[PDB]
Design a protein around this nucleic acid. Structure first.
Lengths: 51, 185, 50, 58, 148, 159, 223
RNA sequence: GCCCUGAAAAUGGAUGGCGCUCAAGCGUGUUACCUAUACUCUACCGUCAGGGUUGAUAUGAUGCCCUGACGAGUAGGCAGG
RNA sequence: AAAUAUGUAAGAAGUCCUUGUUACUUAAUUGAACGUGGACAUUUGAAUGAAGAGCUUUUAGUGGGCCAUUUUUGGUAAGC
RNA sequence: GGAAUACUGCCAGCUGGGACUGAGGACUGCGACGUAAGUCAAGGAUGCUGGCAUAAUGGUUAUAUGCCGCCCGUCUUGAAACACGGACCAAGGAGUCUAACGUCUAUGCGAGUGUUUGGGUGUAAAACCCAUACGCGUAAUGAAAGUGAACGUAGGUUGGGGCCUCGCAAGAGGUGCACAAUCGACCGAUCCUGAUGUCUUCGGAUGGAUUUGAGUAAGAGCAUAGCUGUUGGGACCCGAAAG
C-alpha cells in the first residue's frame, strides 16, 4: 500500500537481501587494500614528464 | 508529457455481455460466466463469448450441417453444440440419433432430431451433463452467406454485386459492363 | 447530388404530390358502414341471400 | 484569384497513422500471369499425385 | 422518437453537425443525379458500372407471366408429397404403387436437377424438365409424364 | 506544358557506363532463373525490349514466372499508405541474381554443417550472428615504441 | 483440516528459510567476485606500468541512458529510437547493452540524451529505490524477492541482487532482465545540471551525449 | 580588439523603464540563488486495461472488490447525464 | 564522384535424404513444378521494441492554409 | 628517503535542524531482534496533554490590498481590432415529417415469412380472429431463342478455435465447424470438338480452352422496430435581380 525504500528503513533492507547484515558486521564497505611495492619503469615517468 | 505510441483510453472492440434484454439469455450468460471462471475448460470460454454475439454473427446452423459434421470419424456419438438456433432441412433423408444442444430449435428441426430417436437439449441442460464441455462438437453457421456481403468490396474488377433495386437488362448492364459500351468494369 | 455506394433510387415526388395524399383514417369507419350496409340490405331482401 | 498549386506537405504524416503495414502474403499465391502451358500441365500433374496418393489408401 | 435523436445532442453547439467552413447549403453539386457523366462520374463508374447507354432488344407490350414457369429442384421434390404419406412410399419403394406428383398443381413449371433424391420410384407430372432432372428420376425407377 | 513520358528523366539512368558500350556479353544469357529467385532489376539501355520502367531501377523482387526470354518478377510498391503488388515482365538482360541471397543460402549450409559437427560431439551450437563487440583489455608495450609526442602546428600561407 | 494447515505452512516456512540461505550465499559470492575483479584491474595497470608498458581497460559493455529533452518537435528518426529505447518521457532512463548495433542508436538519439558508464553504487541504488518490474503490462514495485523469482526465476535470478548482478555484468539474459525493469522515472537533478544551458554537448560545456564516468554524479542527484 | 569618423525625417520618447562608467557596458571563467500547467513522491476525480468474487450464505451482478497506466483539443464522431 | 536519402535479404511457408505425379520439358526419369515417406527444434539462424496482433462494415468534417531551419527557382528587392 | 594533504570515488558508517503528507481500517504477507516467553520502526499514525461556548472554526458575501485578466459572436492563414452584427428586457425563434433505400442492432418466426385490400368479431377508429391471393426469399445465365448446378464421405492442399486419445506434466497424435489463401468439379454465356441418329438438314452426344457471369458446391430469409446515413419533397431557418 506504500512503497518502503531499502536505502532507509533497515527492515526492508534486510527483507530484500540478507547479507547486508554480514556486510555491515564485517564492515567491508571500507576494508583496507593489501599493500604492494610495484614501482613504474623509467620509460613511463620519462614520457610522463616529457615536453 | 509522454510521447504516446498508442491510442489512449482505447477500448477493446469486444462485446462484454449480450446487447439483448432477454432475461433468460442474461441467466444463460450468468451461468456460463461462472463455468468459464471456475473451470479450466476452453469450451466454456467459447460458449460464454458466443452468447454475446449479435444475430448476424449467429447465423443458423442447419440440420443437414449437423448430420454431415456427425459423419466425421470419431464423431458419431458426440453431443453437438450450437450457440444459436438450428433449422430444419428437407434435403437430407437419413438423419442419425445424437443430442443437439442449442439456443432455439425450429419446429421442423426439433422434430427431425427427435423422430430419429435423438434428443433436444438447452444450454444449461448441456451444462450439467458436461460442465467441462466433454465430448462436444461446437458448430457454427456460414457468415459470408449473408446477402449483405455480396455488395462488400464493390469496385472496378472486384467482381462483386451492385446495390441495385430492380435487376434486369436496362439495369446497370450497358456502359462499363461490356467491351462494346465504353469499357468493361 | 450523387455519393457513396448506395442503390440509385427512383422516388417520383417532383410533382406537387402533397395535394393528392390519401390517408385511410376511415378504414375503421368504412368497415362498420360496409357491415351496416350489408345487414340492412339482407333484412329487406326478405329471406334471399345477398 | 491565384492559389497554392501543389504540395506533399503533411502527406507522409497522414500516410503513417494506419499506414504501410506490409504486403499481405501467403503460401500458394495468385497464379495471375503464370505461363498458360504449365498451369495446364500442372493440373494433370496434381490430379495424378492425388490419384496415386489415395490409391495408397484404397 | 425525437428524444433519441442527434440534433438533441447538438443544441448549443453552433452550426449543428455541419461544419463552419463548408456550411450546410442548398444542393451543392445539384439535385438528384445531375452530371453522372461529368462532375459525378467517378462514383457512377465503380459503384454503378453499366448505368449509361443501351443493351439488347426492346419488347413492346411485354406480358409478364407469359413467362410464368417457377422452378423446383430434385433437391426438394419429395416436399410436395403430404408429409404423412411420405414415409409410406419411401419404405415401400414399389413400381406398381409409386406416388404421383402433380408439380403444376404445386404451383411450379419446371423441374431442375440440383441435388439427390433416394432410389424410390416416382411419377412426376410437369410441364418442362431439364435433361438431368429426368435422368435422375429415370435412374431411381420413376418417370416424367409431360402435362400442360 | 509539363512532360511525363515513359522514359522521362532517364537520360543518365538508362545510359551505359564509360567504355562498356556495345554488345552484351554471353554470361547474361547463360544464367538460369527459378521461381522464387531473388533478382535485382537494372535496365540495359541497348536492350529496348522487355525493359523495366524507371521506378523499378535499383529495385529487387521475387521471380514468379519463367518464359521464353523473360522472367516475371514481383515487386512490392508503395502507393498511398499501403504497399501494392506489382508483376513485371522483364527480359533477361535487365536482371541479375541477388548476391546477398547467394550469401544467405551459403550461410544456411554452413549453419547445417556446424550443427552436425556440434551434435556429432554432443556439444553446444551457437549459430546466430552477433554484432561487433566493445573490445577486451590489452597491454600495449613500449619496446621499440616510446611514444612520439605531438603538438598543434603554427599557421602558414603557401600561395 | 486443523492439522493440514500447519503442514502446508511449515512447508513454506521451511522453503522460504532455504531460499533465503541461497540468496545470502549468492550475495556473498558477488561481493567477492566484484572485490576481486576490480582489484585485478588495479594491479593489472600497476604491473603493466612496472613492465614499462600500458594496461588498457576493456571497453564498457554497459550504459545508462537518460532522456533530458521533452517530447515536442523531435525529428521522426530519433523519435523512433527514443521509443525503441523506452525513453518517451523526459528524465526517464534505461540500461543499454553496448554493441555496435546499439551504439549507432545512441549516435542518432544523442542530442536528447545524457549517458555514460554506471557504477555498481549507481545501479544498486537505482534498482533498490526505483526498481519496478513489468508484469502483465503493469508496473510493480520490487518490494519482495518473490516477485523477481516469480518472473525472472526461469533464468536463475531469484533476488534483487541477482537482478543487479545480471545488469552490471551484462551476460546471458541481460535482454530479458533489462526488459523486466520498467524505465526508471528519475526526478530533475537536485543541485541542478551544473551548466547554464543543457542542449549543447557535455564537451561543449553542457549536457547530452556521452559524459562517460560522469553519468553517476548526474543520476545520483536525479535518483 | 573596444572606441571615434563615415551615420540626414518629419507629435514628444524609449537597451521594456529607471538609471548604470575598475558598470548595472564588451570578451571569458567559477560558484550560489530565483521560477512553468514539465520532471519525482503522495491524496482525490475520471477514462482504459487486467484480475478476484453471489458456494448455503438479507440491502447494488449492468454489483462489491484488487491492481497498473493514462488525462491538450477546433471542424467532427460516439457515450453518459 | 561523396554525404544524406533509397531496394532486398537475415529461414518451419526452412534444410537435407529417399523416390511419387505430369499431357509441360529434355537426346535421356533428363529437367521443371507440386508431393508421399525419413531426419533436424537449448541460440531455430543479427539488434532494439511491441504499450496485444489480424480483419470487416460504415459514416462525419476537410478538400482557401500559413510559418521556421535547411535545399531551392522567378525577381533589384519585398512582411513578394 | 619517509610522510602528510588536496582532487576524485565507495561505505548495506554514525548522527543534528526544517518542511509537506498520515491514504488504509479485524486477522492473513515477507521479515527483524531475542536462549527464551516474548518483542518490533516488518502489507499506510499513534501516544500524552491542552484549548473552544452568545466561542474556536468553516461557508457565503461586500470592500480593500498584491499579482494577473482587451468584446463577445463570426468568416478567416491571421480579430481586441481602424472587419461585420449586437443600446436594453421579456416572450417567440432554425435538421422536421414523409415515400423509397445502405449499413449496424434488437426481436418474432424460419426454407420460408408478411393477421389489418378485404372478411369475421367487438366492452367499437381498440383488443381478439381469418380464407384465397399477392410480395420478398429458396436459381442462375444470356441481347435473345433458350438452357439450367454432386466424378469424389459435396473434392484436394495449407492455416484453423473447440472437442477426442496418450501422457503426471511438457508434449505428441486424431478430428477439425466459422473464416482465409490456392488447385479442382458443376450451371449459364462465348469460341471450339461434332459420336449414335434423321425425312439431307434436322439433331447436339462427348471432350475441350491465358475467355466471361451480380451462379453451384447440406439453404437464410421475411417482417416489425431504433440510431446514423442516401434521394425526392418548402426539406435546418431567414434572403435576390427576375419569370
Amino acid at each position: 500500500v506504500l512503497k518502503k525504500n531499502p536505502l532507509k528503513n533497515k527492515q526492508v533492507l534486510l527483507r530484500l537481501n540478507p547479507y547486508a547484515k554480514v556486510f555491515a558486521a564485517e564492515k567491508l564497505g571500507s576494508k583496507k587494500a593489501e599493500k604492494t611495492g610495484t614501482k613504474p619503469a623509467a620509460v613511463f615517468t620519462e614520457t610522463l614528464k616529457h615536453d | 508529457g509522454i510521447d504516446h505510441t498508442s491510442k489512449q483510453h482505447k477500448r477493446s472492440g469486444h462485446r462484454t455481455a449480450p446487447k439483448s434484454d432477454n432475461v433468460y439469455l442474461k441467466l444463460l450468460v450468468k451461468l456460463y460466466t461462472f463455468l468459464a471462471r471456475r473451470t479450466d475448460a476452453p469450451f466454456n470460454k467459447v460458449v460464454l463469448k458466443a452468447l454475446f454475439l449479435s444475430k448476424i454473427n449467429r447465423p443458423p446452423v442447419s440440420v443437414s450441417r449437423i448430420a454431415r459434421a456427425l459423419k466425421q470419424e470419431g464423431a458419431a456419438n458426440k453431443t453437438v453444440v450450437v450457440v444459436g438456433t438450428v433449422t430444419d432441412d428437407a434435403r437430407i433423408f437419413e438423419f442419425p440419433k445424437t443430442t443437439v444442444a442449442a439456443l432455439r430449435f425450429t419446429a421442423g428441426a426439433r422434430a427431425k432430431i427427435v423422430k430419429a430417436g435423438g434428443e433436444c437439449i438447452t444450454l444449461d441442460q448441456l451444462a450439467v451433463r458436461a460442465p467441462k464441455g466433454q465430448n462436444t462438437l461446437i458448430l457454427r453457421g456460414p457468415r459470408n452467406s449473408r446477402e449483405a456481403v455480396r455488395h462488400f468490396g464493390m469496385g472496378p474488377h472486384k467482381g462483386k454485386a451492385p446495390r441495385i433495386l430492380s435487376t434486369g437488362r436496362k439495369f446497370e448492364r450497358a456502359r462499363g459492363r461490356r467491351r462494346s459500351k465504353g469499357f468493361k468494369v | 447530388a450523387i455519393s457513396k455506394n448506395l442503390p440509385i433510387l427512383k422516388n417520383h415526388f417532383r410533382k406537387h404530390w402533397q395535394e393528392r395524399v390519401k390517408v385511410h383514417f376511415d378504414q375503421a369507419g368504412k368497415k362498420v358502414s360496409r357491415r351496416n350496409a350489408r345487414a340492412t340490405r339482407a333484412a329487406k331482401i326478405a329471406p334471399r341471400p345477398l | 484569384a491565384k492559389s497554392k498549386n501543389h504540395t506533399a506537405h503533411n502527406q507522409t504524416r497522414k500516410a503513417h497513422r494506419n499506414g504501410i503495414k506490409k504486403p499481405k502474403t501467403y503460401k500458394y499465391p495468385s497464379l495471375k500471369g503464370v505461363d498458360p502451358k504449365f498451369r495446364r500441365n500442372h493440373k494433370h500433374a496434381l490430379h495424378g499425385t492425388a490419384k496415386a496418393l489415395a490409391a495408397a489408401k484404397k | 422518437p425525437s428524444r433519441f435523436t442527434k440534433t438533441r445532442k447538438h443544441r448549443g453547439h453552433v452550426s449543428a453537425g455541419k461544419g463552419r467552413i463548408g456550411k450546410h447549403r442548398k444542393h451543392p453539386g445539384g439535385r438528384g443525379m445531375a452530371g453522372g457523366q461529368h462532375h459525378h462520374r467517378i462514383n457512377m463508374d465503380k459503384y454503378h458500372p453499366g448505368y449509361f447507354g443501351k443493351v439488347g432488344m426492346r419488347y413492346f407490350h411485354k406480358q409478364q407471366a407469359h413467362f410464368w414457369k417457377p422452378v423446383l429442384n430434385l433437391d426438394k421434390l419429395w416436399t410436395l408429397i403430404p408429409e404423412d404419406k411420405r414415409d409410406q412410399y419411401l419404405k415401400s419403394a414399389s413400381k406398381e404403387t409409386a406416388p404421383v406428383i402433380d408439380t403444376l398443381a404445386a404451383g411450379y413449371g419446371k423441374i431442375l436437377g440440383k441435388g439427390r433424391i433416394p432410389n424410390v420410384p416416382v411419377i412426376v407430372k410437369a410441364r418442362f424438365v431439364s435433361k438431368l432432372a429426368e435422368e435422375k428420376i429415370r435412374a431411381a425407377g420413376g418417370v416424367v409424364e409431360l402435362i400442360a | 506544358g509539363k512532360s511525363h513520358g515513359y522514359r522521362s528523366r532517364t537520360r543518365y539512368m538508362f545510359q551505359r557506363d564509360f567504355r562498356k558500350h556495345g554488345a552484351v556479353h554471353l554470361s547474361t544469357y547463360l544464367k538460369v532463373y527459378k521461381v522464387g529467385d531473388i533478382v535485382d532489376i537494372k535496365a540495359n539501355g541497348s536492350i529496348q525490349k522487355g525493359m523495366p520502367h524507371k521506378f523499378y531501377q535499383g529495385k529487387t523482387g521475387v521471380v514468379y514466372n519463367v518464359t521464353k526470354s523473360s522472367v516475371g518478377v514481383i515487386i512490392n510498391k508503395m502507393v498511398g499508405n499501403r504497399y501494392l503488388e506489382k508483376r513485371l515482365n522483364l527480359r533477361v538482360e535487365h536482371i541479375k541474381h541477388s548476391k546477398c541471397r547467394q550469401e544467405f543460402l551459403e550461410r544456411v549450409k554452413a549453419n547445417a554443417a556446424k550443427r552436425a559437427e556440434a551434435k556429432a560431439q554432443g556439444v553446444a551450437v551457437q549459430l546466430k550472428r552477433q554484432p561487433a563487440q566493445p573490445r577486451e583489455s590489452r597491454i600495449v608495450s613500449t619496446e621499440g615504441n616510446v611514444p612520439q609526442t605531438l603538438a598543434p602546428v603554427p599557421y602558414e600561407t603557401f600561395i | 483440516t486443523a492439522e493440514q494447515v500447519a503442514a502446508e505452512r511449515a512447508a513454506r516456512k521451511a522453503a522460504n528459510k532455504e531460499k533465503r540461505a541461497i540468496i545470502l550465499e549468492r550475495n556473498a559470492a558477488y561481493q567477492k567476485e566484484y572485490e576481486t575483479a576490480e582489484r585485478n584491474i588495479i594491479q593489472a595497470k600497476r604491473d603493466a606500468k612496472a613492465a614499462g608498458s600500458y594496461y588498457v581497460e576493456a571497453q564498457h559493455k554497459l550504459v545508462f541512458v537518460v532522456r533530458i529533452k521533452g517530447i515536442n518537435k523531435i525529428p521522426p528518426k530519433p523519435r523512433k529510437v527514443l521509443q525503441l529505447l523506452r525513453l518517451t518521457r523526459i528524465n526517464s532512463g534505461t540500461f543499454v547493452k553496448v554493441t555496435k548495433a546499439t551504439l549507432e542508436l545512441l549516435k542518432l538519439i544523442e542530442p536528447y540524451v545524457a549517458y555514460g558508464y554506471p557504477s555498481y553504487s549507481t545501479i544498486r541504488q537505482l534498482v533498490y529505490k526505483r526498481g519496478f518490474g513489468k508484469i502483465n503490462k503493469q508496473r510493480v514495485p520490487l518490494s519482495d524477492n518473490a516477485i523477481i523469482e516469480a518472473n525472472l526465476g526461469k533464468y536463475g535470478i531469484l533476488s534483487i541482487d541477482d537482478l543487479i548482478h545480471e545488469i552490471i555484468t551484462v551476460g546471458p539474459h541481460f535482454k530479458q532482465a533489462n526488459n523486466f525493469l520498467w524505465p526508471f522515472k528519475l526526478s530533475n537533478p537536485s543541485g541542478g545540471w551544473g551548466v547554464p544551458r543543457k542542449f549543447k554537448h557535455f564537451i561543449q560545456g553542457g549536457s547530452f551525449g556521452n559524459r562517460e564516468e560522469f553519468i553517476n554524479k548526474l543520476v545520483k542527484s536525479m535518483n
